[PDB]
Structure 1
Amino acid sequence: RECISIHVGQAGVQIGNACWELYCLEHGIQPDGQMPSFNTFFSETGAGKHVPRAVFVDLEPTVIDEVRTGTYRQLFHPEQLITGKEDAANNYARGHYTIGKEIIDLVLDRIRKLADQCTGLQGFSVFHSFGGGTGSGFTSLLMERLSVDYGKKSKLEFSIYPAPQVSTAVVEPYNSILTTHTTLEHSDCAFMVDNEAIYDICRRNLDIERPTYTNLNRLIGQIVSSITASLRFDGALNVDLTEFQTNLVPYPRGHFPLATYAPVISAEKAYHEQLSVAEITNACFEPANQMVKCDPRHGKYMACCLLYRGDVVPKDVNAAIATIKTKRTIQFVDWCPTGFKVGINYEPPTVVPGGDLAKVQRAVCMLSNTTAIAEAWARLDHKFDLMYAKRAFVHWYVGEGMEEGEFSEAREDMAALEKDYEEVGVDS
């Protein structure tokens, strides 16, 4: 019943920092590993120290060093903290090939070591970003190997969705297009969120006009914990990760369920307001709490999964579902009946001490696969196209051995993906 977390790149690792901090908060784990009390994620020592079963990869020493100098440096095993010396430079060509390919063997052997520590490997999940060099480059490299060795294990990916308006990486389209090509075909499911959309959540629901990544990742951590800690904890409907895959992936392509999370409420907003299960789920179908800037009303739904924490009675859930099925404007694709996975954990929602979110007594996470995602690809299509037509920055990949045909090909694979969304949109 075990799983592995993999943190690649800054985004992967810094999100991971929040994630493991939250898992410590879930059980009262001390920075040194001492836990007085979740062995699905952790491995126990004779001292009662538990080791989070995870791998941290950075090709630049700095971020891992940040871990190594922080409080959780005692928690993590030195072998889990893997670092190279040089970067990918925002560039798949080095991340996947030239540079990252050198260290990956080590990385894999640490993974395999942990796989041998697992007794019942259920699977794993990889945290990264769609635009970066290691964030997406190295990441896909890893998938190429992991899908061989662990072909039957859960291969869930979580990635930051490139913001349409702000991006620090000029060749991000190129990176992301190459990842599509290589991740679609290897991964089982990839989830993503938009930091821009999140900012809007922070300013509207948390009332914060100063979000940093350390805020943004707390919110992400909430979502992740709902599906990682609480799915291993007790509930009414205990849903596994493999079950998630078995209930969220409808086609052999990928699919890309997007996250939505409600409650996201400031402490003051929690006052004077009573949420019910149904009210929280109402919020879950509002564009306003959509974690990716993509309009839910534009597309049609294919999948939807609702996962519940704390004070949730199935009775209320059932009523809530009835209304979301019938009251809303949620259009859905023919193919699908509304079999929405309901996970119901008794495990209460948790809050980070010193965080922004209010203590809540119940909480709902929503995953959804909508046809509007093709518009996200359309965004990438043109951004890629523009660059590629001019061949701007192309020498930074070509010099590492990339082929122009390959890039065209990858775009075409994306186009095919868009076409399949088109297909799904056609009802039948």
Structure 2
Amino acid sequence: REIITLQLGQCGNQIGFEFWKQLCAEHGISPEAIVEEFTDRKDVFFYQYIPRAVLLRVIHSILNSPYAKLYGNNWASGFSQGEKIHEDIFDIIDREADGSDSLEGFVLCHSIAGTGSGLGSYLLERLNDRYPKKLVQTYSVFPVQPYNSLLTLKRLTQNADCLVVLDNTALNRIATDRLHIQSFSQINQLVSTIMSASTTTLRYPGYMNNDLIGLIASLIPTPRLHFLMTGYTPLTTVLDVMRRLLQPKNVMVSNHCYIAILNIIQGEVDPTQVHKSLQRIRERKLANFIPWGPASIQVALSRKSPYLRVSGLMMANHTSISSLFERTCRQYDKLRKREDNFDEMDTSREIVQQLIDEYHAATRPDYIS
């Protein structure tokens, strides 16, 4: 099962270009697409080695970079032009699909803040037409700006089978708090750390989680509550790492309860004190979950690349993600009272309200019905 990734807009290119650089080094692969001599499953993202990427003036910046041998501002402009090249970019994706053994997903990296917004809205619609059995995960990045942002949310709530939020605001704080930057060339270094460590269980096979649909169906219980946030502590036992992930200082997000937690421990920690910490987290009650359904916390170990110390990443499905929407929803109405049908915006307006209500209904002891 192979995962063909997409990169749209200046954001998607920059994070993806730095995502591949983090992966190319984590394996024994020279930037010349040649394996270095110097066990790790590398067929998912690489084709025997060439990465399975379909990019879409930053492109020239990549073609001049040493990695050259490895391959307007309106939302309407993005959706319009995307229709004019419907056959062009689908020729590439189709020829890249059948050449692969068995396609599994479409990890799409785009920012909802110019053309990446309108084009990505076009793709996520068109993929569900032709490919109805392919998961579509998206590493969307949060920042007329209120308009282009929410319009993509209309598509991301009914097409994308998963979504990982990464807002530049909360990232900028961690850029200022523990890195003291005051730049895009620095915050993306943290984004590339989150994207690479997200698929560490696919590239390093273990007991479980050897396929993308194994990481998805565990967290996302229902087709609607499909938004996830991340947590990465290393910026020492398993109890030291588990306690730091639950602190609000580490989450990349600016009653409320969790739905499902998955912990990624990339250390060489002995697998015997893994149940003791989980036992302790239950006692001190450092996190609460949904009251209606049985919600449990899962922890997964892996092995660090010898070619490159304990780290940790947490995939979270938290109801407090509804706050980020309200900030978009709020500023929209203000721009709606300040200035061929203008119905798509209002129709998108309604469905976002259905989503936020579903979150605030998820924290109720009677979320069923």
Q: CA deviation at 1:42?
A: 0.9
Residue 53 of structure 2 corresponds to which residue in structure 1? 54
User: Whole-Å Cα distance in 2 between the matches of residues 312 and 287 of structure 1?
Assistant: 25
User: Whole-Å Cα distance in 2 between the matches of residues 195 and 225 of structure 1?
Assistant: 18
Scaled by the length of structure 1, what TM-score is found? 0.80
Residue 418 of structure 1 corresponds to which residue in structure 2? 356
Residue 278 of structure 1 corresponds to which residue in structure 2? 239
Comparing 309-318 with 219-228, greater Cα deviation is found at 309-318
- Does the C-alpha gap of structure 1 residues 363 and 313 become closer, same or farther in structure 2, counting only changes over 3 Å? same
Comparing 223-232 with 18-27, greater Cα deviation is found at 223-232
Identify the structure with the greater strand proportion.
Answer: 1
- Does the C-alpha gap of structure 1 residues 263 and 211 become closer, same or farther in structure 2, counting only changes over 3 Å? farther
- Does the C-alpha gap of structure 1 residues 342 and 187 become closer, same or farther in structure 2, counting only changes over 3 Å? same
The equivalent position to 2:155 in structure 1, one of 175, 182, 185, is 182
Superposed, 1:389-408 pairs within 5 Å as 389-391=337-339, 403-408=341-346
The equivalent position to 1:314 in structure 2, one of 256, 259, 271, is 271
Secondary structure in 2 matching 1:235: coil
The equivalent position to 1:248 in structure 2, one of 219, 237, 248, is 219
User: Whole-Å Cα distance in 2 between the matches of residues 321 and 248 of structure 1?
Assistant: 18
Superposed, 1:13-412 pairs within 5 Å as 13-36=13-36, 38-44=42-48, 50-57=49-56, 62-76=57-71, 89-96=72-79, 98-131=80-113, 133-162=114-143, 171-204=144-177, 207-210=178-181, 212-264=183-235, 275-293=236-254, 299-348=256-305, 361-391=309-339, 403-412=341-350
Secondary structure in 2 matching 1:287: coil
Q: CA deviation at 1:93?
A: 0.8
CA contact (8 A) 1:305 1:368 kept: yes
Secondary structure in 1 matching 2:266: strand
User: Whole-Å Cα distance in 1 between the matches of residues 142 and 90 of structure 2?
Assistant: 26
Q: CA deviation at 1:230?
A: 4.0
Q: CA deviation at 1:3?
A: 0.7
Q: CA deviation at 1:74?
A: 1.1
User: Whole-Å Cα distance in 2 between the matches of residues 365 and 223 of structure 1?
Assistant: 8
Scaled by the length of structure 2, what TM-score is found? 0.92
- Does the C-alpha gap of structure 1 residues 315 and 56 become closer, same or farther in structure 2, counting only changes over 3 Å? same
Q: For residue 21 of structure 2, what is the amino acid of its counterpart?
A: E
User: Whole-Å Cα distance in 1 between the matches of residues 200 and 320 of structure 2?
Assistant: 30
1:11-57 deviations in whole A, cap 9, x for unaligned? 1110001110011101132222111361221112xxxxx11001111
Comparing 311-320 with 62-71, greater Cα deviation is found at 311-320
Q: CA deviation at 1:238?
A: 4.0
Comparing 191-200 with 329-338, greater Cα deviation is found at 329-338
- Does the C-alpha gap of structure 1 residues 22 and 230 become closer, same or farther in structure 2, counting only changes over 3 Å? farther
Secondary structure in 2 matching 1:314: coil
Secondary structure in 1 matching 2:358: helix
User: Whole-Å Cα distance in 2 between the matches of residues 235 and 313 of structure 1?
Assistant: 15
Q: For residue 56 of structure 1, what is the amino acid of its counterpart?
A: L
Q: For residue 118 of structure 2, what is the amino acid of its counterpart?
A: G
CA contact (8 A) 2:200 2:302 kept: no
User: Whole-Å Cα distance in 2 between the matches of residues 411 and 7 of structure 1?
Assistant: 27
Q: For residue 120 of structure 1, what is the amino acid of its counterpart?
A: S
Q: Which runs of 5+ in 2 are unaligned?
A: none
Q: For residue 148 of structure 1, what is the amino acid of its counterpart?
A: D
Q: For residue 99 of structure 2, what is the amino acid of its counterpart?
A: Q
1:320-357 deviations in whole A, cap 9, x for unaligned? 22232332342211234332333321234986xxxxxx
User: Whole-Å Cα distance in 1 between the matches of residues 210 and 283 of structure 2?
Assistant: 26
Q: For residue 365 of structure 1, what is the amino acid of its counterpart?
A: L
Q: For residue 127 of structure 1, what is the amino acid of its counterpart?
A: C
Secondary structure in 1 matching 2:137: strand
1:99-157 deviations in whole A, cap 9, x for unaligned? 122224322221111111210222121101121x3222111211112223332222101
User: Could you list the runs of 4 or more consecutive aligned residues of structure 1 that deviate by over 4 angstroms after TM superposition?
Assistant: 348-351
User: Whole-Å Cα distance in 2 between the matches of residues 211 and 249 of structure 1?
Assistant: 37
CA contact (8 A) 1:23 1:229 kept: no
Secondary structure in 2 matching 1:292: coil
Secondary structure in 2 matching 1:335: coil
User: Whole-Å Cα distance in 2 between the matches of residues 254 and 424 of structure 1?
Assistant: 9
- Does the C-alpha gap of structure 1 residues 211 and 33 become closer, same or farther in structure 2, counting only changes over 3 Å? farther
User: Whole-Å Cα distance in 2 between the matches of residues 349 and 404 of structure 1?
Assistant: 56
User: Whole-Å Cα distance in 2 between the matches of residues 21 and 263 of structure 1?
Assistant: 20
CA contact (8 A) 1:305 1:340 kept: yes
**How high is the sequence identity, in percent, across the aligned residues?**
32
User: Whole-Å Cα distance in 2 between the matches of residues 135 and 350 of structure 1?
Assistant: 35
What number of residue pairs does the alignment pair up? 362
Q: Which runs of 5+ in 1 are unaligned?
A: 45-49, 77-88, 163-170, 265-274, 352-360, 392-400
Comparing 24-33 with 223-232, greater Cα deviation is found at 223-232
Q: For residue 180 of structure 1, what is the amino acid of its counterpart?
A: L
- Does the C-alpha gap of structure 1 residues 108 and 387 become closer, same or farther in structure 2, counting only changes over 3 Å? same
Q: For residue 423 of structure 1, what is the amino acid of its counterpart?
A: A
